[PDB]
Design a binder for this molecule. Sequence first.
Ligand code: TX0
Length: 181
Amino acid sequence: MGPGFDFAQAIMKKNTVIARTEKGEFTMLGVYDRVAVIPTHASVGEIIYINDVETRVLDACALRDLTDTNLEITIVKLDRNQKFRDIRHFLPRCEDDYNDAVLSVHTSKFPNMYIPVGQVTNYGFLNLGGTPTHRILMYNFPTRAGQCGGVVTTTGKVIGIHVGGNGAQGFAAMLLHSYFT
Ligand SMILES: O=C(O)c1ccsc1
């Protein structure tokens, strides 16, 4: 509809795949080369399905901060015959708050879905499904099961991936440039 949705659509059409684990179907953001991200609660194993194709996982790392606190981001290197467009230059360098964000989801359940979530707060600490979690972003949108892994963008920045909600608010894990140097 406008320049928020334009940037969101470019990221979705080139830099997302559908990932399936034993824990469900997720939006998965490709960042550069064969490196992608997914919520840690997807429980990535040795094999994952990518767009319904059996794919070996070359490496997987569940990120934690230097206090040994969950960040809810798993970085995955996929045994795929093609690289992602490099979008590292759209990642923020620091923790921040944002205006006018879009949450974009692409799965079998929610194809080509874009949600204007509005203002995004640096919320910080969240007890997410019982697990203490840091670097959480919050938006005041009533997000639903099936949105996990959804990409949060502003015009020109890829800022986070959706990891949960409480029925009134949605929560994303921050993406930072330093995760992918
Ligand atoms: O390839 C691209 O840059 C693209 C795809 C959809 S909108 C922009």
